[PDB]
């Protein structure tokens, strides 16, 4: 049989083409009877000002509700009738609209995607209906303690920059954003050099290219004009937001140092180090015996309900750290053990646990790129962020290079003696003071 090493070579190359307006069109072909197609746009809340914050989110609500060719429910009627799935998401940096469909349905699926992007018929009555829907969604998101702390951590880490803003916007923006605000956003941002037609599945690249010229070519043939549109770095702070609510039964805490952006090679080693610390929740089988010292100590001594490590990437910055959920009498112990692990990895990381993290990352990467949809997302996202698709064999090369020395170097660079951003929500009396969290970021013994 093939090895793991051989198996990565046998993964077929992503084919890339540029259309004349600057729309990139990209496809990974497999043998599958189904596909995923979609448009990834370099647009999100980081591009929005104070006054139009939440516009893209508003557009996301309007994108599927009618076009100039397919008014009202006509689009969803066509998607439903062929058994397709039409989906969307919005982050701080990326918007996506994608269709899960039969491979024989890729002609119509590309035709619909173009119709959504170019020809959004934002009828005044529809934008009024969506006002109340988004407002209710804000009330819903208030009850998710995870979503609140991560919004809080962004709001404090990126303090006075566009990365501080939520995707959905404030409620005053939701109730006063006009159609003209929305079309101005669409005009400025939905432009061909900034968006990617991605596909994965049972398709030739040739026909993906054909359909791209067929349906997308009226986008930026002479629309390459106005201030097109530089992002600018976001100042990370080192600060604390503490929403004390003793009426909630569990504390949420998220803590992060400033990460580097999408581009940086340091991400691979940081991800290895994050894998060593890992994740946990209360439904994990066998707690005491888990490899991660944090996960093991948390399970045995009932220190939390869950934790997760993360490395959120933006352009030229990010959030590197962890989040947890615990009882009111446990925040101090959780924070102690978390910080000790960061410190341990900076100073005294060893060969064996780094192998375990390396292996966890190969297993995560490969297990993630499994299905037409995650592969299509990855084609789309990667061309926005790296400008290539980075093939699986390259990641393996980048993973393999990481050893204990790299983990000690790269963790020290971002973690050791750095100011964290801290976000606390719930019963947080026992959340350590910021000075004492700052003091947890170095070791007196080292």
């Amino acid at each position: 049989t093939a090895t793991y090493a051989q198996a990565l070579q046998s993964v077929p190359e992503t084919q890339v083409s540029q259309l004349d307006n600057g729309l990139r069109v990209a496809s990974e072909q497999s043998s599958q009877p189904t596909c995923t197609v979609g448009v990834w746009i370099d647009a999100g809340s980081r591009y929005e000002s104070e006054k139009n914050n939440g516009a893209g989110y508003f557009v996301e609500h309007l994108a599927f509700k009618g076009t100039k060719n397919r008014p009202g429910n006509a689009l969803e009627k066509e998607v439903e009738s062929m058994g397709a799935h039409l989906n969307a998401y919005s982050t701080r940096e990326h918007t996506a609209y994608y269709i899960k469909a039969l491979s024989k349905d890729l002609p119509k699926a590309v035709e619909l995607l173009a119709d959504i992007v170019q020809n959004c018929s934002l009828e005044d009555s529809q934008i009024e209906k969506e006002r109340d829907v988004i407002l209710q969604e804000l009330q819903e998101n208030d009850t998710s303690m995870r979503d609140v702390v991560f919004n809080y951590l962004h709001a404090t880490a990126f303090q006075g920059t566009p990365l501080a803003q939520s995707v959905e916007g404030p409620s005053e923006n939701v109730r006063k954003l006009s159609r003209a605000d929305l079309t101005e956003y669409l005009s400025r941002h939905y432009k061909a050099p900034r968006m990617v037609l991605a596909a994965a599945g049972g398709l030739e690249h040739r026909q993906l290219l054909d359909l791209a010229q067929k349906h997308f070519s009226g986008l930026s043939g002479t629309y390459d004009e106005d201030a097109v549109p530089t992002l600018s770095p976001c100042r990370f702070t080192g600060s604390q937001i503490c929403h004390r609510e003793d009426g909630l039964p569990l504390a949420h805490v998220a803590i992060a140092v400033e990460g580097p952006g999408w581009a940086h090679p340091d991400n691979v080693a940081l991800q290895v180090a994050n894998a060593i610390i890992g994740h946990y929740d209360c439904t994990y089988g066998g707690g005491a015996h888990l490899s991660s010292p944090l996960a093991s100590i948390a399970a045995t001594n009932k220190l939390c309900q869950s934790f997760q490590t993360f490395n959120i990437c933006y352009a030229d910055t990010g959030l590197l750290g962890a989040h947890f959920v615990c009882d009111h009498m446990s925040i101090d112990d959780m924070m102690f053990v978390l910080q000790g692990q960061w410190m341990r990895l900076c100073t005294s990381a060893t060969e064996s646990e780094v192998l375990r993290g390396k292996n966890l990352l190969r297993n995560a990467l490969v297990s993630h790129l499994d299905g037409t949809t995650p592969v299509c997302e990855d084609i789309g996202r990667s061309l926005l962020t790296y400008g290539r698709r980075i093939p699986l064999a390259e990641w393996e090369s980048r993973i393999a290079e990481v050893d204990a020395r790299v983990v000690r170097e790269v963790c020290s660079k971002y973690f050791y003696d750095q100011c964290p951003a801290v976000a606390g929500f719930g019963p947080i009396e026992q959340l350590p003071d910021y000075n004492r969290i700052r003091s947890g970021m170095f070791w007196l013994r080292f």
């Binding site: 804000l138 609140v148 303090q159 006075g160 409620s171 770095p233 990370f236």
Partner: protein, 49 residues
């Protein structure tokens, strides 16, 4: 509606090399800790004497 929470302006209290929100703090990071640790380093030297 938790999305109505902005962190208030801290310009009044900020170190001068950290007032530009358009510019990275990582650059002034070594300097700012440098100044504050030099204070404690000199104090320890002073107390040591």
């Amino acid at each position: 509606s938790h999305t109505d929470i902005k962190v208030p302006d801290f310009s009044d209290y900020r170190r001068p090399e950290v007032l530009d929100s358009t510019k990275s703090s990582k650059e002034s990071s070594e300097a700012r800790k440098g100044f504050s640790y030099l204070v404690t380093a000199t104090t320890t030297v002073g107390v040591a004497y």
